[PDB]
Every structure is written in C-alpha cells, then in structure tokens.
Amino acid sequence: AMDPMKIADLMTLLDHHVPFSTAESWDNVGLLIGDEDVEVTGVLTALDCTLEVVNEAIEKGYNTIISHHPLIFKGVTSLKANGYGLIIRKLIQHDINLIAMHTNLDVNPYGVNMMLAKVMGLKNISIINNQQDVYYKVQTYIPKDNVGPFKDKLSENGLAQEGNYEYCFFESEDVDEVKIEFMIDAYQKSRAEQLIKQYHPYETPVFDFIEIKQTSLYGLGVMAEVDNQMTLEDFAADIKSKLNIPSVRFVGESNQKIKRIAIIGGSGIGYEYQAVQQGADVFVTGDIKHHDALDAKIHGVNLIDINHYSEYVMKEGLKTLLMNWFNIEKINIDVEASTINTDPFQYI
Amino acid sequence: DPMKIADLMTLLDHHVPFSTAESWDNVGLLIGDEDVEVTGVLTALDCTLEVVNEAIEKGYNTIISHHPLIFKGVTSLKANGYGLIIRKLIQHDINLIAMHTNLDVNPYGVNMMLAKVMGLKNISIINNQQDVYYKVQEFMIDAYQKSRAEQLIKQTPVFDFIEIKQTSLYGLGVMAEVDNQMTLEDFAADIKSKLNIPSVRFVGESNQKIKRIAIIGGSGIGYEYQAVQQGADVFVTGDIKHHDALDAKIHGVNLIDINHYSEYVMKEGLKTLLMNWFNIEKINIDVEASTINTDPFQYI
Amino acid sequence: DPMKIADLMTLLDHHVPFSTAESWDNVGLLIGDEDVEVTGVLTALDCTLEVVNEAIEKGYNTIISHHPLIFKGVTSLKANGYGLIIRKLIQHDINLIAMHTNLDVNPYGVNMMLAKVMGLKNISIINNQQDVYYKVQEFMIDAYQKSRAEQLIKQTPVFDFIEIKQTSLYGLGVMAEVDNQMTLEDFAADIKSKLNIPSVRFVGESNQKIKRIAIIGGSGIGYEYQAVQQGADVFVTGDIKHHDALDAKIHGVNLIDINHYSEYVMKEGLKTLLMNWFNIEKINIDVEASTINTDPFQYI
Amino acid sequence: AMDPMKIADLMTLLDHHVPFSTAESWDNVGLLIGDEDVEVTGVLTALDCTLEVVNEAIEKGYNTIISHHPLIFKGVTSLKANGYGLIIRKLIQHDINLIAMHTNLDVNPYGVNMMLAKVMGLKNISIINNQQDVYYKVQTYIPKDNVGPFKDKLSENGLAQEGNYEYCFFESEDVDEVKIEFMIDAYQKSRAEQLIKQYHPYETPVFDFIEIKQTSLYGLGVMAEVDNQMTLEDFAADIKSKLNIPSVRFVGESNQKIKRIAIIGGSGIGYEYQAVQQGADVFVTGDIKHHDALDAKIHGVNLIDINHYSEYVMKEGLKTLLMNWFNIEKINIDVEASTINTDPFQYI
Amino acid sequence: DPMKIADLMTLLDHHVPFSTAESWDNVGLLIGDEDVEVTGVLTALDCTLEVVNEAIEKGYNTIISHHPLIFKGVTSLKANGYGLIIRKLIQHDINLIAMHTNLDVNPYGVNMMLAKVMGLKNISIINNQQDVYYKVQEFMIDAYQKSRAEQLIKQTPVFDFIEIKQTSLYGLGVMAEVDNQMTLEDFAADIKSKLNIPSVRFVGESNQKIKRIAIIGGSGIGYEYQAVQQGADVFVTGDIKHHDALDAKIHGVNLIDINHYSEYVMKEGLKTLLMNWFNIEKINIDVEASTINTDPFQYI
Amino acid sequence: AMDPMKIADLMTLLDHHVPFSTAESWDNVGLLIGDEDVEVTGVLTALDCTLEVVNEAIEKGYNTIISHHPLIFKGVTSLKANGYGLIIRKLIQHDINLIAMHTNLDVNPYGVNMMLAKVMGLKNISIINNQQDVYYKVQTYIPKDNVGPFKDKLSENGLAQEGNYEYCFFESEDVDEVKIEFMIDAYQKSRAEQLIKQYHPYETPVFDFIEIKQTSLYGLGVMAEVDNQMTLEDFAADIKSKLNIPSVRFVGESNQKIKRIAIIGGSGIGYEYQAVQQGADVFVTGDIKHHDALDAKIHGVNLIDINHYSEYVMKEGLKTLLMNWFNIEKINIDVEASTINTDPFQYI
Ligand SMILES: [Zn+2]
Ligand SMILES: [Zn+2]
Ligand SMILES: [Zn+2]
Ligand SMILES: [Zn+2]
Ligand SMILES: [Zn+2]
Ligand SMILES: [Zn+2]
Ligand SMILES: [Zn+2]
Ligand SMILES: [Zn+2]
Ligand SMILES: [Zn+2]
Ligand SMILES: [Zn+2]
Ligand SMILES: [Zn+2]
Ligand SMILES: [Zn+2]
C-alpha cells in the first residue's frame, strides 16, 4: 500500500532544501492555507497567488500552489467574497493548498537572487549579507583509559555527530584528565546536558557550552560579475532583454564601467550603500523611489530598477528545483510554473 | 424578494449600529458572501465547530455570534484549531456575522439581557458614549451630514457648523435594582440560580445590603470603581482575578463574578430581538438560539 | 525700495501660506539671509548642484525649490554629497527657499498644475484641511484673533468664543475630469505625451473607462481608496510599488504611475504664479524655471 | 552579650536559601517596610499581608511578617488612612517589619510549586522553565616550574575556588607555557582582572574571560507525576480535596488520561503551550479566563484552574522551611503560618 | 467645631484648586488621616527630616510643603533615606499635604510671591490654562454641570450644550516690571539681595536694559522663548544648565538663574495666605513658616 | 614636493590618539563642517565654537577649529543669518574647518577628566566606568609537521599579529592535530574567515571564533586622590581657586573628610551613586540641579558642582596634546588654545 506524498511530506522536503527558519521573523511562510493530511495531486509555482493562478491550478487538476509572496501576510480580519477574501475562499472551496516560500527563498543559495544572476548570464555568483548561525562548543572533562570510549560511544550512539577532539591535562596536578570537545547546533543544548549527565560520573561532572557563531550559507542578495566589463547603460539594456522587462531605469553615468553586480530582487533599497562597501559597481533591485534614487545619484551609488515584478523568475526556477528534489526522492508528481503574467502594472 | 446577507447586515446595523463597537473590535460580516440568500439564522456566543455542525444540521446558512471568531488577523487557515471552524464555514457556504461590542453597549444588548434574566427593575445604560451632532447656523445635523450640507448650502453665503456633544443612548454596562434590598450572599445565590451558573464567587461581606447593581457582561474589571461612583452597591462581571478582587475588597467595593460565559444569555436574547425585527419587516426567516453549551470550563 | 528675502517670504506666505505645510515638513527660508536684496528667482523641483550652478550663471541669488534640500537635520556640512550643494549656496551667497507641502495643498499648486498640464476640466481640491474660526458672542475671528479679542473686549463684561470648523480651501490632491470618456490605456498614453514622460505604467484593465481623475503628485499612495470613495475612476500619482499596485488591482482600484519626477511641472507653474504676484505688486524681478532635468532615473 | 537576630540577619538567611536576585526584574522583593536594625521577636508567614494579618502579628507579639505577595508593588503615591494606606500605616505605627518573598519563592526548588506538587501528593517533582546563569571560564597563560603554584596559591588565597585545570603548550614554538583555567560567577570578573594583574608577570599578561551559560536550579513551575494514571476529572477532584478548594474548573475531556502535570501557582496562563511541549498532560494554575480556556480547549491543551488563592500553601510551607533554616543556625525565634483565610472571593 | 484635615483640604482646594496641578504631579494629602484634628500648620518647601523634627517641636501635626515628598511611587519604606522622613511622619501622627504645581500656577502662588519679593509692579499670570465652560441652549455651566443639567432638563425636550473655551486665571509664570529700567547686572544684583541668594548667574550683556520680567520659579527652562514672545526682556528661573544658557545667549534671550531653591519664598507666602483664609473662616489655628534652610547646596 | 597636512591627515592623527569610535552612539563627532582635501594653516582649540571663536581663528589666519562641544548636535533644519546659523555660515564663508572631539575626549585616558584631575593637583588618577571591547579568540585545527609554519607564516604575512598559541591533541584517537589560537579585533572576523579558508586544507576545515570581552582603556570619568586628606569645604575652595571658578557649590557636611574623588566634567549627574560604590568620597561634576542634590544629600552622597563650564580646561589640555602629537610626526603647524571666555553665565 502506497505512500503517496501528502502536504506534510512536501513540507518536510521543502524545508530540507529551503529551510523555513531562514525566513525573516516578520515574514509569514510555510503552509498558509490547506490541510497537511491531503494527498498532493500536482504543484503549480507562482510569484503571487492571484485569482487567475487559482483558476489555473483548478483547470490543471493540481491541488497545491507554492507562491513566493504570502497571500496572507498580516492577519486577515475577514473572509468575504471580495478582494483577497475571494481568492482565499476559492482555495478553500476547491481544496487547494497554498504554501508560501518567501524570504527563505530570497536568502537561499539557490533562491531568487541566484536565479536572477543566472538569468542575467552572470558568473562567480556568491551569496552576500550572510546570516549568522549559533552553535555550541561543548567541553567535558573525563579521566583517560576506558571511560573515554565509554563516553565517546554512548554520546555518538544518542546522536551528536561523532567528530570529537581530545587533549590531555591535569585537574585539581592531582587528577589527570582528558578534555573532550565537539559541536552542537543551538537546539541540541538541552539534549547535550541530559546525555552528559546520564553517562558521566562525579558529584559535580564538569561540562561547558561555549557559544560559537558561524557565517551562514544563507543571506539576502548575491554578488556576481559580468563576463566582460560593460557600461552601466549597456548592462541595463542587456538585463531588460534577458528578463523580458517592458521598461528599466538606472541611476548613474550611462558610460560608467560595471564589473561587479549586487542583486536583491523585490524591494532591496536600504542595502545599496552596503553593497557598494562589499564591492558592487551597481545595485540591482526593484521598487526604487525618487528620493532614494536622488540620494544614490549624489553619492555615486549606481542603481538599476528591474522592477519588483522581476522576482517572477522564481516560478520556472523553483519548478526546476522541485523537479530535481522530486527526482532524487523518486516522486512522480507533476510540477509546472504558472504562465500567467500577474504583474499589476501595464507599461506604455 | 428574499433576504440576502447584505439585507440582514443593513437591518442589524439599523438596530445595533456596528459603529458603536470599539475601534479595536472586529464586527460585521466576518466570513461569507453578502449576495447569498439567508436560509435561517442561528445565534451563538462562541462559534465553535459544534455550533457550525448545528447550523448545517438545521439547514441554516447564517450564524450570528457575539464573540468574533476572527479577532486578530488569521495568519494561516489550516485543518487544525480555529482553522478547522473557519474552513468548515467556507466549505459549507455558512455566513458568520459578529455583533460583538456593538451588542455589549446596546440599550437592548448583553447587559439589558443580563439584568432581565436576573429579574431586575429600573434598568438604564451606564458609561454612555458621546454623539457628535452639529447645529447649523438654525437646525440639527448628524456626523456625515456636515459635508453635504456645505455641498448643498453653497448653491456667496455665510454659514456655521457648531459642534454639539450629546450623551449617547449607547454605553457599556447597565445600572439596575432589585425590588427589595437583599444580602450580597442572597443576591449572588439568586443570580447563580437564574443564570444556571455552576459556581459563582463574590467579594464583600456576605451580609452587605444590595439594592443598586451595575452589570458588565464578559470581562468588565476596570469599571468597578466608576460603578460605585455611579451608585452601585455591587459590580457584576466575569473573569475576575485574585489581585483585582483583593483590591476591591480592601477598598470596600463589592463584586460578583458570574463568569464571562454568562454572556451566553445573548443567544436567546438575540433570537428574540431578531424575530421581532423580522416581524416588523415581514421577513419569514427562522431564527434559533444555539443549544450547545460552549463553555470551555467544566466545574467540580 | 528693492525687494529683500524677507519681503519675498511675506509675499509667498500670503499666496501659499507656509502654515498649510505638514507638521513634519521643512519649509520657508532654509539657507540664506533675509536682509539680502533679491537679484532674481530660479524655480526648481530639486536643488541639485547643477541648479546652483545655473542660478550663479544667470546672476540669480534666490532659488525656490519644491523639495526641501535640508529635510531631516544635517549632521555635517562637508565637501561631499548634499554637503557640496549646501556649501556652494552659502559660499555664493545664494538663498534657498522651500515651498514644499504648502505648494502640494495649494488651490494653485502642484496638483492644479498637474491637472492643467493634462488638459483637465472641473478641477477642484480634494482631501480638504479644516480651518478653525471662532464666532464671538456676534462676529467672526481667525486663529490668533482669540487672544487679542479678550485683550480688547476686557476694556466686567460677559463674552464667548465659539469654535466653528470650516472646510479649508487647502487640500492634498485635486479631482478633475476629461472632456470625453476615454480608456485607461488612452488616458495614460495621453498624459505620458503631455508630461513628456519616458515611461508610464497603469493598474487596471486597459479598456476601463475614465471620466473622473484624482491626482496627487509625488508619492500619494495611501490615498487611492479615499479617491475612489470621492468618485475617481483612476488615481494618478508617482512612486507606486508592486504590493500597493497588486492590492489596488485586486480591489478594482485603477492607478497610473506618472513618476514622482512629474512634480517638475511646478517649475514653470511656480514661475508663472510668481511673475503674476510680482506684477500685482509692481516688482521688477526676473523669474526663470530651471531648465535642468534633475531626474536621477534614466529610462531604457 | 548576645547577638539576637536583627531584620538584617534574617534578610541574609532568607537570601541564602531563596536568593532575592532570582525574582523577576519587574518584581518588588525583600524588606518592603521596616528597619534592618530592629531585633526580630517572631515571624508570621502570609500570602497577602491584609489588615487582619497585621492585627494577628500584633496580637501574637511578632514584629516581622513574611508575605508572598508584595504589599507595595507599584510605588504608592500616598499613605492615607484608607485602603492599602491603612495597612502600611498600621505596620509602621506598630513597628512591624514586612518582607516580601515573591517571584524568588515562585522559582525556588523548595518554593510555591514544589509545595503545590507535594500537597497534591505528586512524585518525581522537577523544576521547569529554568533560568540561565552567566559564568566565566577564565584562562591565563603562565610558564611551568614554580610560577604555577605561585599563581595557584595566591589566586586561591584571595578567593576564586581552588578548582583549576592545566594544559601544556607553546607560545610564540618559542616560549613553552601552561594554560590554566577555572570558573568564576559573573560578579567576580572585576576581582579576577585585578588579582591576575597583581600576581602575574609580563608587559602584556595574557588572560581571557569566556562567557559560559549554565542551566539554573531556579525556574518558574514544576513538572511532576501522579502515582497512578488518572482521568482529568478525577485528578481535578483529588486536588480540590487535598488543597481544600471550594470550586475547581478544568478544560479538557473529563475522561482524558493524565500522568504528567505542570504546575504554576498563581496566574501562569501564557505557559500552558510550552508546558505541553515539555511533556505535560495538564497545566495547573489559577486566574484562568474564558478566552484563554477556549483557545486551550480547541488546541487540546488540558487545564485546571485551582484558583490563584491556592498559593496559600506557602504559609505552612515557608513556616516549615524557616523553622528548618533557624534550626540549622540554632535560632530560637518562633515562626507561625497565618491562619487567616485572606481569599477575597467567597464561593457559592 | 474643630478643623480636621478633611476641612483643611476643602479650604485649600477652594483657594488653590488641586485640579490646576499638572497631570503628572502628586498633590493633596500625601501622608495622613483626614479625620485628624489640625493642631497647627507648618509651611515648607521641602519636607526634610529637620522640618518634621521642627513640626514635632512646635506641637504641629500638619505640614504643607510645595514639593511632594512622595512623587513617584515609593517602592519601600525603610529606616533610611526618604523612608526615614515618611516613617517619622507616620509614627508621630503628622499629616503631610503637598500644594505643588497647583501653587506654581495660582494667581497668588509661587510666581506672584517671587515677583512681590523682588518688588515688582503690574504682575500678571502668563501661560494661562484654558477652562471649559458650556453655554446651554441660554445660560452658563461648569465642567461637571453637563451631566446633571441633562439629568435635570430631561424632566420630550430639545436642548444643546455648546463648548466654550475660556482663558483661565491659572498659569505657569508671571510677567511683571520694574519701576524704572535697570541694567541686567543691576537687576540680577537687586534680586540676589532681596531673595538672600548666595550666588546668582545671568545670561546676556551686563548692560542690557530690563523693564519687563518673566518669572517661573523652580525649573522653568523650556519657557524662555515664549516669554520673550510675550514681551519679557529677561526670563528668571532656577536650575539653568550650560547648553540651555548657551542657546539663549546665541539667540539673544536673557536669563537669570536665581536657583531652584528660591521657591523657599512660598513658606512665608503660604503662611500669610493661610492666616488670611483662616481669618475669613474664623479658624483659630496657628500657622508658621519653617525656618530651616533646606537647600542641599552650600555655596563658596 | 611637499606633503602639507590636509584636514584628512589631521583626522587620521586625531583618531589615532582619541579614537572617534569611543564616542557615544548618540554623539556627533569628527569633521562637522569643512573639506578633507583642504591644507591646515593652523589649529585653534575651543570648548564651544562661538562666533567670537570663529572671529579669533580668522584674525589669527587659522583655518581649523577643534572644539569639545559639537556645534551641530541634532541635525540643523536651516542655515539662516541668525543664531547658530550665523556661526555655521561664517565658518563656511571663510573656509574654516570645524572638528568636534566630544565624548571621545570625555572618555580618553588623556582627555577631559585626566585634565580636570591634573589641574586640581590630584594623584593616582585612573579611568573609571570602563568601556568593554569585543575581541575574538580564533581557534583552528591543523596537522603537525610543516603545515604548522605553513599556516603561521602565511597568516602572519597577511596581517593578524604573529602571537600564536599551540597545543597537541587528537581528532576523530585517529588524526593527531595541533590546535592553534590567536586574537583578532571584532572587525577582523571577516578577513580571518577568508585567510583561514585560503591557506588551510580539508573538505571541512575546522575553525572557531570565540567572543572575548576585555575591559577597555576608555571610560567616562576618573577616580583620583588628594595628596593629603581634606575636608569637603576645603577641597571645594581649593579647586575653585585652581580652576578659577567664580562660584562653587557642594552637597554634604562641610567638615566631611575627603580622600578619593570621582570626576566627570560637564553634566555627570546619574553617575554619583556608582562613583560612591566605586569608592569615591565625593563626586565632582557640573550642571547639578536641586532635586538631584537633595537626593544626594539625604543619601550621604557628597557632590561638588564645579560648573559644566569647567570643561574649558580642555582648550589648553588639547593644545598640549596636539603639539606633542605634531612633534612626534614632525609637523610644524601652530596650535593655540582659544583665550575667549565663552561661558554663557556671568556670576554675581
Ligand atoms: Zn523576494
Ligand atoms: Zn517580493
Ligand atoms: Zn460582550
Ligand atoms: Zn465577551
Ligand atoms: Zn509635492
Ligand atoms: Zn515630492
Ligand atoms: Zn507566586
Ligand atoms: Zn501570586
Ligand atoms: Zn514650583
Ligand atoms: Zn520646584
Ligand atoms: Zn565633555
Ligand atoms: Zn560638555
């Protein structure tokens, strides 16, 4: 008897590759509308889950929509047949599940900004603005001989990855001891306390947790470079064509030479000065407003507004990711990128 | 011409104006479609999953609850917790309307209803709101009338809108009285019995004499000192906590905790009001009070 | 008797009262010396270094900008960034005056100017401020008059100041209309051409029909729902972002982003007003609109 | 010539066993009304120091009242012959001292929640919601031979507990050194700096303080278990009887099987979800309100409201503690638990 | 029928209404028993332990201080610091009343008292409060009268309460004048001598000419710009700090720091007022000004 | 062709000796008005940069003013010919540069409070209220033999001061390793990550950054002592004379014996209780107000108000410092302390 993938199985897989915990604390991510117990019949990727997207999923026989933008962001106070209420109600009425992979996908090594840089044909793409993850270096003190492996083996048996580090030294030079050390993630602190107490000895078994911060693989934005050095206006025209953008605008001398590019898709104004500090010749983002562009201009910070809507690259990008992850796990569920242009703006 | 949700909403607003609700509150049509024809109305304190099941059972597509099922914004709608109730409503095409603080402050609302169930006399609204009305220079106008009256009166004329403040009919709480003075203990026992309450608790000497009573159903602590100022011998409310009771006791302010759940009286009270309003308008729609006891507490 | 900065400031305040500006805003003489004789006036949207160079070139010692060059307090004044422009003004004895939100809400200001440049009809101020005026008991008085009228009327008399609130002439935005209904797409194209805009974008079906138009130049998102309430078929503003456009789209609210930079129309609009005001007062001072395109954006 | 116990001596003893520093930072604990210099004539324990409690102390010839709840919580703005003013004035006029042992007693291993669990007849009682205490691992580098004990001995002489830990290694492999390490509490950092500077050598004597956090023995609440698995309603009836409560109310299916119990006496709503995470079958507390019970019910979190007033168990509990502490120290001062029922509520 | 604390409180409220005190302030009976018969009244700026000892010595059981001994809530009452003074009061059955900001804004209060001690002329309250009074439709009513007048006038009648705002008699500060113009230096020296101040300091050229003087006793910085607006040549207050003095100096605003402690003049000033009020009411109770110099500063 | 000192060269030198980063985060320090590219013609020191000070610099041919107090503190919203606008405009019009050395000079070992204590003739002067600086102890694990110096040499080549510390031990007792450790300042964390990755080996090169906090040399205030124990009033009269103060006021018994003195020039009320904890017999500051003096008196905290204006000692103090720093660097630029008494107060 089969184990067809349920929403709960999909959630675990999504979380493995694009951890929901990497989303900002203000964000609203994960299963927003649906039922964990339901069997997935197909997956439609979307930037914004508009009414037409829901209609498209229904028409295709798919019961799961993964969007970038959370359809429910601040709590909804009503669910009427109007506005966003009409979309939410239609999902529920048709038993469609909606998952949001929002800022977790913005900060992922394979997420929105890797996807943007790739579509722009750029090279040497690296995450920037790295998160910091908290670890602990756990240090225990134990006598030599057989009580060392006795510790090692039991500790490694009950989890806590089998990489240890051992040094001789004297407690008091009365009691000669071995100081053992290993790493734990911040969540394991509790378990590590338990397991050390259970399989150690004395009246006062000595153990320490030393906070270690490590640079994360996750961060908001990428730095990349063009193949060949280019003028600002030529780089702007190039990416307008590659991303099929109706209108692009840039801030800076049109003949400015550009090699290193920082990209935060969406609305990344607030990071442009830091991007310049980090080595960018231009900061690429959307939703750039007059006074921030004016400020950038006077300071010599070069900008390109590719429009917030250029995050739409994640529909095909995430479709490709998910098909790969499904291949690995030998899952045959169909994934399609929504073909609807959901940009609220029409350009003239 | 069959009554739709939109028509119900108009009628309810007429009799219990949604604008009298507190600004923090979430009232009106919370879940539904205003174009849908009302098949029947079930009244509820809390819209639990059992209450939704009851509406479905009775063939009713409209629930009016006191407490808003969605109060702070919902962050997700999953098949769990409150998500389950909201999803069940939507999937069964049930409309949910909340008449919350607008009902608490209505002259015929929660506190009138409590005082009637207690058999009280001389019941009047306390803690009255203030209505803003302009005298135009002379005749009277309401809040919104101030825009159009310029838009009308400017067809070179010299005119004036004078703000006048009027004590509202609407307010949180009622003051009322027993026929004859009774002890605090006897009054607490009397209302326990009348409201079918499993357990009541009071603050004050059992032999204190009670004539004038202030009532705020739900959770009305914060108002007990004012009530005493307004003439109450006792303040009746729910959800009274230790430190607030201890303060009242030391200050000589008498209280009775009838439990927040005592707002359940609005189910029958609202059923009766709505049957009457329907009668006036010649609407032939069935209204029932939910029979489900939705108190999360069981008393021993 | 030659006009000084102080005299200019008086005249500008007469026609576009600096007190109609928002309380957060920074308006008036921002950089200068009120005793200095005005040699000429250059109007500007943003006072860039190029605009300062232009004033110097033209022999003008007075610039009137819409946008305040100093908005939040300056923490330093170095030869870099905005420091460069402020220092250049001072070192060349150029006076900078900001007519910012007071011009946005003026009956002849930014939004009248936008609606005229679009060739619109029936243009009226929307979002009107409220003026406080007292009726004394009877005759009328203004804001400041309430002090002196006691100081005058107390020379034992029994008197009254009655607060009356009056719809102001001043407000953020105008409502206006085209001669004949046109599609949303055609109207957007029409205004693109009339304002010489490199790129315009709109929200709403291209074949939506437009008759009544609400305009707030600059960055007016926050007001689009109210505008629709006030009768607009479309809200015209700049600096529209994705999520605000997506919200409007789902709610059926039509928008056009003409870009914040479209406030540049106030350069010629202000030049014309100031030439007229000068004429009335028989002041022979040259006024020019800056010809510099100061948009930080270049469009492709 | 005697050393009769003064309030200041009592305060030191109280603080030793139920440290005032473990109280919450918003709390108001310790000597609230009185004179440190005054000789203690007897001690009356109380939940709330009401007028009748003060009258009881006067009648008994006791000049010290220890209450759980602070009679002065937010600053008093007046002291009139009315309300709480009348109680405060009566204490002062009769030279009665009032000490509050509030949230420090809530979080103590022998405090309010241990006492509740014991009165309920429960077993395997353990503190939960543990505080974290900050320590430092101080590391200094010193040459071997005689300068090691020279360091050890002087450091241990000037306090800083004589548990050291020593390891060989090379500074620069030019200057061979011994790295010595030991623990200090967070307050000793200053002294440790001084003492290391004074008895070390070089131009730049190398020493480090490494922050270590340890799970405290103090925490808000206990987890315990019933002897024999029981239904929720039976457990509720049992504890109503054991604590002599006029009325108890519970949230949950009456036949729910209960083994593990979390208890926060007083008003502990806000912790029930965490208690369930920590393994509780039911969260026992007081002052439970409708909407929080409604939420608990829908989420399957089981609750029992034993009333805030059930904290009254600390009068006899603290009396027993204090008599034990006085025995140890050979102090003959009488301690009595106030017999007044001070519950503002009367149940019908 | 001997005067109790409650009767004193009524009389003081009549002449120096406790409701004119700032909302942050702590005034009235701070420590005491309103049923206790007043044996005598000692006036005080600060109620120090020495002032309590003086009351006890004189056989007086009532102290009226300007500064509230309890301002923010007391968190403990131990035999140390301020605890010592509060405990001594209570243990000796001394009643402490605070007439703080209500005395600062009174027409006969701190600032009248300062201006009199300086020998000034044409003294008037500045910074006046606003009194709310309703004209009922016509006759006048006060703040509280608005409730009962409905409760009275509703025995179907159509009526109106019109809010009228009236300049109060009460305000922080006085404006006053010398008989003849004098230099800033000479005026500072004159008031130093008249108030027996060990050290005075002034801001402004020593030869500036002074005629009109604004005074706020205590710590009145924040009001100096307004005072100049109101016509003052100099603002007189205490507790002036470097940066506030430097700002005033650069703006041409003249100041004199007479020290916060100069509010001590209210001891004799209040003694005189209270003897007079007692006379009117035929109360034979002794009132003395405390003779203790309570300044924490000693000057060298 | 010369390298005459420009403002940018002066800024670097100032920052070296009195780091701008030690200023409070609310403060406004450094070059407030001027041009980094301009050649310095002479330096005038000032407490407050008043109009007369600017006039004095012009008259002397000096184009640089260093003040203690920042002429621009909260952003200026206008620059009119009035008030502070007139001073700012006059600086700009005459090409005068103004640097503020504000709270950085308050907390410097040679700054305002050292200068105050020295002018008072005091001894044993020590900074108090020390800042804490964040460092990292970087720990890497590397095999013995030749890969150790290979690491050492390259790491030391690319900066990161050549003080290392080495200990033997076993990774897994499979792979025997050397644990190397060294210090970095908090800014080097990024570089250290790079350089370790570049010149280390494995699939997972193990390195840790351990946060170390050290007591700074910078702090607000000094503690010092009088030569000979003195009465409070005599100490007050002495310092009034030494600093030429028109009027001094003190709080405390006039015959109180004084040996240890805490000094925060300016407006240091808020620190007096801590100063007493730290061992002061009197707290010396300016701008003392009635209610704070009243509080101090009742608590037995002794105060002397020497007036905020007594910070004027830094004009000659900083002149002396700067002349010394210029000597070292062989710079011939004139430095003069402004002679203008800029006290807004005149005493009578
Ligand atoms: Zn994104
Ligand atoms: Zn986005
Ligand atoms: Zn209610
Ligand atoms: Zn309720
Ligand atoms: Zn504008
Ligand atoms: Zn603008
Ligand atoms: Zn407790
Ligand atoms: Zn409690
Ligand atoms: Zn005062
Ligand atoms: Zn005062
Ligand atoms: Zn300073
Ligand atoms: Zn200073």
Author numbering:
A (entry chain B), D (entry chain B), F (entry chain B): -3 to 168, 191 to 366
B (entry chain A), C (entry chain A), E (entry chain A): -1 to 135, 199 to 216, 222 to 366
Quote from the publication:
SA1388 was predicted to contain a central PII-like domain and two flanking regions, which together belong to the NIF3-like protein family. Overall, the protein is organized into three distinct structural domains with interconnecting topological connectivities. The two NIF3 domains at the N- and C-terminus of the protein (henceforth denoted as NIF3-N and NIF3-C, respectively) have the same overall fold as canonical NIF3-like proteins, with a central 5 stranded mixed β-sheet and a pair of helices on either side. The middle region of the polypeptide (residues 126–236) bulges out between the two NIF3 domains and is structured as a classical PII-like fold with a (β/α/β)2 architecture, confirming our earlier prediction.
The final model of SA1388 (gi:54040095 Swissprot: P67273;) refined to 2.0Å resolution consists of two subunits in the asymmetric unit. One subunit is traceable across the entire length of polypeptide from the N- to the C-terminus (residues 1 to 366) with the exception of a loop region containing 25 residues (168–193) in the central PII domain. In the other monomer, several more residues are disordered (139 – 193). The two SA1388 monomers in the asymmetric unit tightly associate to form a dimer along the sides of the two NIF3 domains opposite to where the PII-domain is located. Further analysis of symmetry mates within the rhombohedral unit cell showed that the individual subunits are organized into hexamers with a cage-like appearance. In SA1388, the two entries to the central hollow space are capped by the two PII domain trimers. We observe clear electron density for two tightly bound metal ions at the junction of the two NIF3 domains in each SA1388 monomer close to the protein surface that face inside the hexameric toroid. The identity of the metal was determined to be zinc, first by an extended X-ray fluorescence scan at synchrotron and was further confirmed by Inductively Coupled Plasma (ICP) atomic emission spectrometry. Additionally, we observe a clear electron density for a ligand of unknown identity in close proximity to the two bound zinc atoms that would provide two additional metal ligands, one to each of the two metal ions to complete the octahedral metal center configuration. By trial and error, we have ruled out all components in the crystallization solution that might have been inadvertently bound either during crystallization or during cryoprotection and therefore conclude that the observed ligand must in fact be an endogenously bound ligand that was co-purified after recombinant overexpression.
